């Protein structure tokens, strides 16, 4: 199983799959309603549940407190 | 024979002040290189330690069995003696693996002594081959309050003796109390020792420890995960600085394990 | 599937059974607004849900859940508010 974030505009879909891109385009259809990577048009290691692969940017974290620095 | 040693053994502070004023030396040692200061510390005789230090006793003398005055004070349990020696520059880090102050205080559950040794710059994680870390010995001897003091201070919950982690020693012991404690500070339940065995495999068939290592075989709560990560940013005995964070008091106490 | 909405506007669509890892959400339960959790936290929170469910007993070694220090405090507050 392969765990991915599908992101487009300020929305993010969190799901998992395997096989091919074909049925994956329809997975979106049955969620956000539409007809069926990096700068282009996925493994046990490249997309773990806790580290999903991305398929608008998030808010920026605040500065680290001083006591929490090295 | 020696009146000075003899007085120091029994905590006779009047006899000591008498001997000193008649002209007896304070830095007298036996053939074993034991001074009256060593014996005073061994007995936890704070008045006698004060008197000897005032008259120039040496706080870092080493006996033939590798004992220093600080080591003996850690055997006695007198936190006042330990503290007094640390103030006068008693070396925190001994040369012998046979007489480590921080380990002796830890195996005997002398929390306050442990606390002071750490405060004065002792290595909380010092790993002696044939003993382990101070955390490890405290676990072996089921010294609950040393374990909690060491963990709270930032001791590495996973360094024990060789490949045997503290969680292992605790499992053999069957301490349900110490097991929960080590897991709160992030002990690895999936670690294997020199025999390939994991902690759960060393606990009696009839214990709730087995269910504890296995029911919590899943992942910790995200709050637990955040706590481990945040505490990992502070150095030894710096975690109090969590006070200075802009955070609800409930969470500061959670991070401080209070 | 449920819609979790962060404080700066991001919309997170996750499996309902996963989002049920938060007791706080389980109570409120098809669209949950979070006026205090920012997107860079809520995203990590959803990842934790995925991680939690997937590894909630797979007889394998569970891997470390990565947490950068800069997000730890806000994430702890979120974990506290969400009971997970």
């Amino acid at each position: 199983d392969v765990f991915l974030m599908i992101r487009r505009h300020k929305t993010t879909i969190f799901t998992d799959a395997k096989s091919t891109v074909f049925e994956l385009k329809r997975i979106v259809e049955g969620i956000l309603k539409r007809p069926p990577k990096d700068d282009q048009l996925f493994t046990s290691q490249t997309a773990r549940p806790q580290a999903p692969a991305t398929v608008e940017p998030f808010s920026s974290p605040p500065e680290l407190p001083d006591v929490m620095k090295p | 024979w020696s009146p000075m040693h003899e007085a120091a053994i029994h905590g006779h502070q009047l006899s000591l002040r008498n001997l000193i004023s008649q002209g007896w030396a304070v830095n007298i040692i036996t053939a074993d290189h034991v001074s009256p200061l060593h014996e005073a510390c061994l007995g936890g005789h704070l008045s006698c330690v004060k008197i000897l230090l005032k008259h120039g006793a040496q706080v870092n003398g080493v006996t033939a069995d590798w004992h220093t005055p600080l080591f003996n004070a850690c055997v006695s349990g007198s936190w006042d003696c330990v503290n007094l020696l640390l103030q006068h520059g008693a070396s925190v880090q001994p040369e012998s693996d046979l007489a480590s102050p921080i380990h002796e205080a830890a195996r005997r559950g002398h929390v306050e002594c442990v606390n002071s040794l750490i405060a004065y710059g002792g290595n909380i994680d010092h790993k002696i081959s044939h003993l382990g870390t101070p955390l490890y010995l405290a676990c072996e001897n089921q010294q609950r309050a040393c374990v909690k003091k060491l963990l709270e201070s930032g001791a590495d919950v996973n360094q024990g003796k060789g490949q045997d982690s503290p969680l292992h020693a605790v499992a053999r012991t069957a301490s349900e109390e110490l097991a929960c404690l080590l897991m709160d500070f992030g002990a690895d339940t999936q670690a294997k020792n020199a025999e390939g065995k994991r902690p759960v495999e060393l606990v009696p068939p009839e214990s709730p420890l087995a269910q504890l290592f296995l029911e919590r075989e899943g992942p910790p709560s995200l709050m637990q995960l955040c706590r481990l990560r945040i505490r990992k940013c502070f150095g030894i005995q710096q975690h109090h600085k969590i006070t200075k964070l802009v955070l609800p008091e409930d969470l500061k106490q959670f991070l401080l394990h209070l | 599937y449920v819609k979790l909405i962060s404080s700066d506007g991001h919309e997170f669509i996750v499996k309902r059974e996963h989002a049920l890892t938060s007791g706080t959400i389980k109570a409120m339960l098809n669209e949950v607004n979070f006026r205090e959790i920012p997107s860079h936290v809520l995203s990590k929170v959803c990842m934790y849900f995925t991680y939690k469910v997937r590894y909630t007993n797979s007889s394998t070694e569970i891997p470390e859940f990565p947490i950068a220090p800069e997000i730890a405090l806000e994430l702890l507050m979120a974990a506290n508010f969400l009971d997970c």
Side-chain angles (χ1 to χ4, degrees), chain A residues 1-3 5-8 10-12 14-18 20-21 23 27-28 30 35-36 38 42-45 47 49-70, chain B residues 1-53 55-94 96-147 149-189 191 193-196 198-210 212-213 218-243 245-258, chain C residues 1-2 4-14 16 18-19 21-25 27-28 30-53 55 57 60 62-84:
Chain A
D1 275 316
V2 138
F3 307 83
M5 277 180 287
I6 311 173
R7 316 191 42 216
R8 203 126 290 143
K10 285 168 68 120
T11 96
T12 306
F14 269 80
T15 167
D16 57 328
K18 33 187 59 182
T20 92
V21 198
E23 52 272 56
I27 293 311
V28 186
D38 270 321
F42 286 56
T43 340
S44 54
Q45 303 175 0
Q50 73 284 5
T54 298
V55 177
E56 186 217 1
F58 295 143
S59 52
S60 198
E63 279 294 346
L64 191 63
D66 279 44
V67 294
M68 280 180 77
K69 294 184 183 154
Chain B
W1 173 71
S2 177
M4 203 74 174
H5 282 85
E6 183 71 14
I9 285 182
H10 302 298
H12 294 169
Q13 84 284 8
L14 297 185
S15 302
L16 262 185
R17 125 240 197 236
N18 283 13
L19 293 168
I20 290 172
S21 86
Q22 294 169 37
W24 292 90
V26 147
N27 296 293
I28 184 168
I29 58 171
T30 64
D32 282 336
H33 276 60
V34 176
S35 70
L37 180 61
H38 284 94
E39 305 275 39
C41 290
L42 193 57
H45 301 308
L46 180 69
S47 353
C48 294
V49 169
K50 291 181 180 179
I51 301 190
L52 298 163
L53 285 185
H55 288 94
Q58 293 171 9
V59 326
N60 281 307
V62 176
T63 74
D65 294 342
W66 298 104
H67 298 164
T68 55
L70 182 60
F71 175 82
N72 291 351
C74 282
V75 173
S76 78
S78 183
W79 178 52
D80 283 327
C81 292
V82 162
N83 258 328
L84 194 56
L85 295 164
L86 289 172
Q87 279 178 31
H88 283 69
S91 180
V92 129
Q93 38 193 313
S96 175
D97 281 352
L98 297 188
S100 176
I102 188 170
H103 287 94
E104 191 67 19
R107 65 190 314 169
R108 292 173 178 273
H110 292 160
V111 184
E112 294 307 321
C113 289
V114 172
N115 185 71
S116 278
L117 282 167
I118 290 159
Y120 268 86
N123 178 13
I124 189 172
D125 285 322
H126 188 212
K127 192 175 177 161
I128 305 199
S129 60
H130 94 88
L131 269 186
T133 49
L135 186 51
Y136 188 87
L137 290 175
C139 283
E140 269 190 351
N141 297 268
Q142 311 206 47
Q143 299 297 355
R144 200 219 174 266
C146 268
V147 169
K149 179 52 83 189
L150 284 165
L151 290 177
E152 289 187 335
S153 300
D156 188 339
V157 71
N158 289 320
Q159 284 290 2
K161 177 190 186 180
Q163 275 175 67
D164 209 40
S165 71
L167 201 39
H168 288 101
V170 164
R172 281 182 203 99
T173 250
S175 176
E176 299 171 1
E177 186 80 11
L178 290 190
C180 291
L181 193 56
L182 283 184
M183 280 173 60
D184 280 352
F185 279 82
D188 192 352
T189 48
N193 64 33
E195 283 93 330
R198 278 170 169 175
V200 68
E201 311 178 340
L202 298 163
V203 3
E206 77 241 20
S207 198
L209 267 196
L212 188 95
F213 293 156
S221 76
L222 177 57
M223 282 187 69
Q224 174 60 357
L225 292 187
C226 289
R227 172 163 70 178
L228 290 163
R229 188 55 192 103
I230 298 171
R231 298 182 48 94
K232 202 197 200 297
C233 300
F234 297 94
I236 307 304
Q237 283 187 353
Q238 308 295 329
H239 300 81
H240 61 85
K241 296 183 185 177
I242 282 186
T243 288
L245 295 172
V246 176
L247 215 60
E249 188 61 41
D250 278 329
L251 293 183
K252 297 188 185 175
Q253 289 180 239
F254 174 65
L255 297 169
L256 285 173
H257 281 80
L258 306 176
Chain C
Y1 285 83
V2 311
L4 302 186
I5 288 171
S6 84
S7 74
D8 47 338
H10 279 63
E11 309 175 5
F12 291 84
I13 265 62
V14 306
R16 189 181 196 99
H18 289 352
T21 282
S22 167
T24 290
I25 286 171
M28 317 177 40
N30 185 242
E31 179 131 323
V32 181
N33 209 238
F34 291 105
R35 268 108 170 178
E36 310 286 344
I37 315 192
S39 62
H40 72 279
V41 173
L42 188 51
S43 41
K44 209 61 161 195
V45 169
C46 294
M47 302 181 191
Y48 175 78
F49 291 158
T50 316
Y51 166 82
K52 174 60 178 195
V53 174
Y55 291 106
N57 59 345
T60 161
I62 301 184
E64 174 148 0
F65 181 86
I67 303 187
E70 293 89 346
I71 65 144
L73 293 181
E74 302 187 278
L75 180 60
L76 174 66
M77 294 247 215
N80 188 38
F81 173 79
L82 292 172
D83 180 33
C84 53

